[PDB]
Amino acid sequence: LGFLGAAGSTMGAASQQHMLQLTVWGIKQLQARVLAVERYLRDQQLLGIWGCSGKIICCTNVPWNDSWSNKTINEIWDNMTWMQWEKEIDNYTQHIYTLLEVSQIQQEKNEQELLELD
Amino acid sequence: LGFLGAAGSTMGAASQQHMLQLTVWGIKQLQARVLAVERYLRDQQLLGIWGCSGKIICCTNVPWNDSWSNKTINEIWDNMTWMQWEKEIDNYTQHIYTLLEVSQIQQEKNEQELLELD
Amino acid sequence: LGFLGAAGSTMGAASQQHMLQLTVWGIKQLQARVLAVERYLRDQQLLGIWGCSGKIICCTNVPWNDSWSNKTINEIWDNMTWMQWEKEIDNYTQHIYTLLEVSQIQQEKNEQELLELD
Amino acid sequence: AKKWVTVYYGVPVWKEATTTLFCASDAKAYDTEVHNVWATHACVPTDPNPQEIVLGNVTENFNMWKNNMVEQMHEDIISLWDQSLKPCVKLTPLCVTLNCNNVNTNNTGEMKNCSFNVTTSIRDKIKKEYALFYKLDVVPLENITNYRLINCNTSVITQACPKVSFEPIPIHYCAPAGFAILKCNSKTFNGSGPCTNVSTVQCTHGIRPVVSTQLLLNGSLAEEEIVIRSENITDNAKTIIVQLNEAVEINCTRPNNNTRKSIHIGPGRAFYATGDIIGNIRQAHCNISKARWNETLGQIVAKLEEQFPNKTIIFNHSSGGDPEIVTHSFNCGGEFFYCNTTPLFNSTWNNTRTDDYPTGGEQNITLQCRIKQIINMWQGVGKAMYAPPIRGQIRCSSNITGLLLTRDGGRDQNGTETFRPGGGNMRDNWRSELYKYKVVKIEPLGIAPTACKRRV
Amino acid sequence: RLINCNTSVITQACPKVSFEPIPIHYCAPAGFAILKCNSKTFNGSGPCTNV
Ligand SMILES: *[C@@H]1O[C@H](CO)[C@@H](O[C@@H]2O[C@H](CO)[C@@H](O[C@@H]3O[C@H](CO)[C@@H](O)[C@H](O)[C@@H]3O)[C@H](O)[C@H]2NC(C)=O)[C@H](O)[C@H]1NC(C)=O
Ligand SMILES: *[C@@H]1O[C@H](CO)[C@@H](O[C@@H]2O[C@H](CO)[C@@H](O[C@@H]3O[C@H](CO)[C@@H](O)[C@H](O)[C@@H]3O)[C@H](O)[C@H]2NC(C)=O)[C@H](O)[C@H]1NC(C)=O
Ligand SMILES: *[C@@H]1O[C@H](CO)[C@@H](O[C@@H]2O[C@H](CO)[C@@H](O)[C@H](O)[C@H]2NC(C)=O)[C@H](O)[C@H]1NC(C)=O
Ligand SMILES: *[C@@H]1O[C@H](CO)[C@@H](O[C@@H]2O[C@H](CO)[C@@H](O)[C@H](O)[C@H]2NC(C)=O)[C@H](O)[C@H]1NC(C)=O
Ligand SMILES: *[C@@H]1O[C@H](CO)[C@@H](O[C@@H]2O[C@H](CO)[C@@H](O)[C@H](O)[C@H]2NC(C)=O)[C@H](O)[C@H]1NC(C)=O
Ligand SMILES: *[C@@H]1O[C@H](CO)[C@@H](O[C@@H]2O[C@H](CO)[C@@H](O)[C@H](O)[C@H]2NC(C)=O)[C@H](O)[C@H]1NC(C)=O
Ligand SMILES: *[C@@H]1O[C@H](CO)[C@@H](O[C@@H]2O[C@H](CO)[C@@H](O)[C@H](O)[C@H]2NC(C)=O)[C@H](O)[C@H]1NC(C)=O
Ligand SMILES: *[C@@H]1O[C@H](CO)[C@@H](O[C@@H]2O[C@H](CO)[C@@H](O)[C@H](O)[C@H]2NC(C)=O)[C@H](O)[C@H]1NC(C)=O
Ligand SMILES: *[C@@H]1O[C@H](CO)[C@@H](O)[C@H](O)[C@H]1NC(C)=O
Ligand SMILES: *[C@@H]1O[C@H](CO)[C@@H](O)[C@H](O)[C@H]1NC(C)=O
Ligand SMILES: *[C@@H]1O[C@H](CO)[C@@H](O)[C@H](O)[C@H]1NC(C)=O
Ligand SMILES: *[C@@H]1O[C@H](CO)[C@@H](O)[C@H](O)[C@H]1NC(C)=O
Ligand SMILES: *[C@@H]1O[C@H](CO)[C@@H](O)[C@H](O)[C@H]1NC(C)=O
Ligand SMILES: *[C@@H]1O[C@H](CO)[C@@H](O)[C@H](O)[C@H]1NC(C)=O
Ligand SMILES: *[C@@H]1O[C@H](CO)[C@@H](O)[C@H](O)[C@H]1NC(C)=O
Ligand SMILES: *[C@@H]1O[C@H](CO)[C@@H](O)[C@H](O)[C@H]1NC(C)=O
Ligand SMILES: *[C@@H]1O[C@H](CO)[C@@H](O)[C@H](O)[C@H]1NC(C)=O
Ligand SMILES: *[C@@H]1O[C@H](CO)[C@@H](O)[C@H](O)[C@H]1NC(C)=O
Ligand SMILES: *[C@@H]1O[C@H](CO)[C@@H](O)[C@H](O)[C@H]1NC(C)=O
Ligand SMILES: *[C@@H]1O[C@H](CO)[C@@H](O)[C@H](O)[C@H]1NC(C)=O
Ligand SMILES: *[C@@H]1O[C@H](CO)[C@@H](O)[C@H](O)[C@H]1NC(C)=O
Ligand SMILES: *[C@@H]1O[C@H](CO)[C@@H](O)[C@H](O)[C@H]1NC(C)=O
Ligand SMILES: *[C@@H]1O[C@H](CO)[C@@H](O)[C@H](O)[C@H]1NC(C)=O
Ligand SMILES: *[C@@H]1O[C@H](CO)[C@@H](O)[C@H](O)[C@H]1NC(C)=O
Ligand SMILES: *[C@@H]1O[C@H](CO)[C@@H](O)[C@H](O)[C@H]1NC(C)=O
Ligand SMILES: *[C@@H]1O[C@H](CO)[C@@H](O)[C@H](O)[C@H]1NC(C)=O
Incomplete structure (x- = not known):
């Protein structure tokens, strides 16, 4: 569990083989394995459609709207400690996902094809 | 279900937390979850070996053989409505998969390595 | 099973729809499907964090330490037949994984961001 | 000129299929922790915004009695009727010889006053008991009328529990991810014909x-x-x-x-x-x-x-x-x-x-x-x-x-x-509600020629 | 008569079946985690500062 070690640091300072038996401890282990594989794949599925498939830091082409937040870059990268920043923009997040889905990939793939016919 | 909205348009115009109980509604839900995860991963596994891993429009290096179809580009991109085009080339599809597997990736990876030793 | 055909060659010469019933043959098939999907995803998860997400031949930026092996390139690419090479460096492998995880990706992503602010 | 193969993902192609459908109730019930017979513990809560995509000019063909949803529902109702009355009281010691007489109002007799020896909870003593029960639950065994109970020749008989409800709450049917249900919107559509107005859902009607x-x-x-x-x-x-x-x-x-x-x-x-x-x-x-x-x-x-x-x-x-x-x-x-x-x-x-x-x-x-x-x-x-x-x-x-x-x-x-x-037949009750649904299967991967090529 | 044979069905436990309380660890699946209080004097229903 390599995460969570910088859970209090600021945002910039963090820069076996057993036959399946249907008994009461077998059902729980099977449910745990299916939960783990689904919860991994939904995050990979979200990262795939944004062009950020195999990266951990991914820049985009979506400009930042000031209705989401009015703060400054060095104001939030030096004070805010990711739990608080996640509680701040929690209302605006789903909308931002849609802007990552269209305006950075749908306009990037099709136009790329228009360069390939030369 | 964001697909299927252009199912009649032409081809160019479309440019909770419950303990797992083994009762009669629990078995069906578990089977549905395993079906969903397998049916996602086989399509991602096919796209991975063609060099088209995180894209929705992917160009290749396989020339189009006229034994597959004799039609024109603007003849099929303006009239044909994907169900009909899928019924047309249904016999030739598996062979084409093999040409995507070898002649665009096996010849692309090895030769790329021959450029990296400089 | 397209692998294993060059299991004796040298290292350079290899250049249906059934309702889920919880009976004694149903439990085995369900366990087999969950084993297959997990064993695929752990290898894809290892390849993802090394920047080698959708490739089969992937070069890196980790220099080869001679404490791992002292042999020559054309000495091991012409004689050694992958089973033997895997038995040779089996003690040093986990450490090498860590050097692929940090010194080729953590130093590549962050520095890439330092080029994007221009 | 110079066509090349090109791969697309997210292409609207479906085929016919046969899969496993699962329940979906809603949260207008499920306030009390009760268990009736149509379980509704394990039914996933349905969505308050069910989506219906109106298709274009599609002319899909349907059948009203070559449907596999009916064969699933007929087996999901028999099986779900046997979870309950599995932990219940067998009435094997009731298959005895019954004495009787008749209740004082005839044809309104349709009741019978019956007496029978029973072996009680302690396996040494004999008790004598009385009960009224109906005609059409008896068979005359051979003057004193001396008969017995209707169904002790051929079956094991099981008392259902009280505090187990029978009220037919609705059931939706959902299909897993990578599948869809097609729905006919024609006004007067018979069985077994083509259509012109088709829509797609993930989740059927509220069938009772x-x-x-x-x-x-x-x-x-x-x-x-x-x-x-x-x-x-x-x-x-x-x-x-x-x-x-x-x-x-x-x-x-x-x-x-x-x-x-x-x-x-x-x-x-x-x-x-x-x-x-x-x-x-x-x-x-x-x-x-x-x-x-x-x-x-x-x-x-x-x-x-x-x-x-x-x-x-x-x-x-x-x-x-x-x-x-x-x-x-x-x-x-x-x-x-x-x-x-x-x-x-x-x-x-x-x-x-x-x-x-x-x-x-x-x-x-x-x-x-x-x-x-x-x-x-x-x-x-x-x-x-x-x-x-x-x-x-x-x-x-x-x-x-x-x-x-x-x-x-x-x-x-x-x-x-x-x-x-x-x-x-019992299936005819559920063909009357499932006549306009058909399960299909999404195939999102497509191959087409166009004039684009890779670079090195 | 015996103590409970008018209200319950009664079942003999087998011999060669042990009752000894061996310890149980509870593990959470991947994607979850368990937090832990390290305060020396901690009541119920409060905050912490050493987690
Ligand atoms: C078909 O079903 C109907 C019931 O809907 C039967 O009709 C019933 O017939 C009886 C005797 O014919 C009717 O009773 C009589 O009514 C008249 C006028 O009120 C009265 O003068 C007689 O003394 C007697 O009360 C009864 O009203 C009628 N039912 C209804 C609902 O009107 C009929 O017998 C069945 N069979 C055939 C072959 O029609
Ligand atoms: C339930 O079990 C009891 C057990 O006593 C049954 O009682 C039986 O009742 C009959 C009728 O009174 C007895 O018959 C006797 O026959 C002699 C000879 O004809 C007569 O002199 C007596 O006056 C009397 O009628 C019988 O002995 C008695 N006991 C047994 C063991 O049969 C009762 O009939 C049973 N009920 C049912 C529904 O099976
Ligand atoms: C269905 O109910 C009707 C009630 O009218 C029955 O019809 C009559 O029932 C009486 C009963 O005394 C008979 O005497 C008659 O012969 C019946 N027929 C007519 C035309 O009056 C009928 O029998 C019932 N059917 C069943 C199967 O119970
Ligand atoms: C049902 O309709 C009947 C009329 O046919 C009502 O009347 C009584 O029905 C019973 C049943 O046979 C008869 O014995 C009575 O003589 C009828 N009385 C009269 C005045 O006709 C009956 O009340 C109705 N029931 C309901 C609940 O509406
Ligand atoms: C059915 O028959 C039995 C015959 O025993 C009736 O039970 C007796 O009824 C009388 C009259 O009320 C009581 O004094 C007795 O105490 C009852 N029990 C016994 C063991 O004798 C019973 O009432 C009858 N039921 C009907 C609806 O007729
Ligand atoms: C349901 O109605 C359709 C009409 O839309 C019928 O389909 C036609 O049936 C006739 C006679 O069998 C054929 O000649 C036609 O070719 C069919 N198609 C069309 C488009 O007209 C269908 O037979 C009806 N089904 C039943 C059971 O009556
Ligand atoms: C409904 O069907 C019954 C038979 O199932 C018919 O009853 C017959 O009627 C004829 C006419 O008098 C008699 O000769 C027969 O003996 C009757 N019984 C049988 C078993 O055939 C009855 O007539 C039918 N109803 C109508 C209105 O025709
Ligand atoms: C456990 O101790 C904490 C002290 O850290 C108590 O928390 C405070 O309780 C008082 C009185 O109820 C409140 O006014 C405060 O708002 C609480 N919080 C803080 C941060 O001081 C808590 O009530 C104690 N719990 C029990 C069951 O005694
Ligand atoms: C947001 O920031 C601007 C300037 O930084 C400031 O004037 C304003 O008061 C802030 N708050 C809101 C709610 O706009
Ligand atoms: C977020 O949404 C909630 C609910 O509508 C609202 O009360 C709150 O003011 C919004 N903004 C923040 C910063 O929480
Ligand atoms: C295919 O196309 C060519 C020219 O476009 C035409 O001559 C031929 O008849 C077509 N059909 C077949 C079966 O070759
Ligand atoms: C495809 O294969 C079938 C079966 O061999 C054959 O009948 C048909 O002519 C082929 N071509 C097309 C265009 O369907
Ligand atoms: C196996 O050994 C033979 C001679 O022993 C050699 O010619 C051959 O190349 C080797 N490899 C394979 C794959 O046959
Ligand atoms: C490793 O290689 C060097 C030179 O290639 C050689 O001198 C040495 O003996 C080899 N073995 C060990 C164990 O160092
Ligand atoms: C690998 O580790 C084992 C166990 O410590 C050791 O005996 C062996 O010498 C090591 N080296 C090789 C080449 O196997
Ligand atoms: C359906 O057909 C009409 C007329 O042929 C056409 O205008 C329309 O674009 C087609 N597609 C849809 C989605 O309505
Ligand atoms: C009986 O008939 C009357 C007509 O006056 C109607 O209002 C009533 O609803 C009927 N009863 C039933 C039970 O339908
Ligand atoms: C039915 O009998 C019970 C006996 O306690 C009585 O309380 C009730 O009022 C009766 N119901 C009617 C409708 O007479
Ligand atoms: C049930 O059993 C009785 C005798 O116990 C017999 O007379 C009767 O015919 C049987 N009924 C059937 C349907 O077998
Ligand atoms: C098809 O059915 C839908 C269902 O609401 C309706 O909105 C639409 O107008 C219908 N189309 C035609 C052409 O009748
Ligand atoms: C049916 O109706 C006709 C009139 O259309 C009439 O002449 C005849 O007597 C009636 N009855 C029969 C049994 O045909
Ligand atoms: C039944 O319908 C016919 C046709 O309208 C009518 O003549 C007859 O009077 C009706 N019967 C009753 C009882 O209303
Ligand atoms: C009944 O059949 C005759 C032919 O035998 C035909 O002339 C007549 O039109 C038919 N009746 C109807 C209402 O069609
Ligand atoms: C329907 O039933 C008739 C009468 O038995 C029969 O002749 C016919 O073949 C059946 N099928 C069709 C499609 O009409
Ligand atoms: C069983 O017997 C005991 C003593 O006779 C009594 O306390 C208990 O209530 C009885 N149980 C039942 C269900 O009658
Ligand atoms: C918090 O608890 C850990 C538990 O070992 C301890 O090592 C650490 O010193 C504690 N921190 C403080 C500030 O008491």
């Missing part, structure tokens, strides 16, 4: 599992016309499903104030019999309206006279049989009613008019129901069920929306065709 014969009660309605479906309408062995456009309301009741005993047989197992009747002893009538059903029966025949366009058509009652086959049988509050429909299928229709209903009488056609305790619905050969008595009075107020018919023979008597209410 009403177990019923001879009539379809809390169902769904057509639009602007009554519609008749059949497989091959010229053949007589195929059943006919009639769907109405205006519902006909019906008001059953059972006036009695009967009580319940509690005979304790075996350790921790109580047997709930029927005690005494407080007050008068009456019938169990039902009262369908008369002027309201006359119009319905008269506009069924306007569509029936087109398929057989010379002959006069008449309606005749059913033929002999078990009382659970030839009568309208249904469930109401916990009892099982068995009313006969000879006052309904009675008449003769020459030219969409009749002489069989006078207008010189009164309205409110009556029906005589009857009660039965031992019920073996779905015709399992070795299983039955004992429904314990409800104390108080019972009322139904059902909402009739369609019916089942079958023809008789091909013998040329006259220009005369007899229809009889006789649809002999």
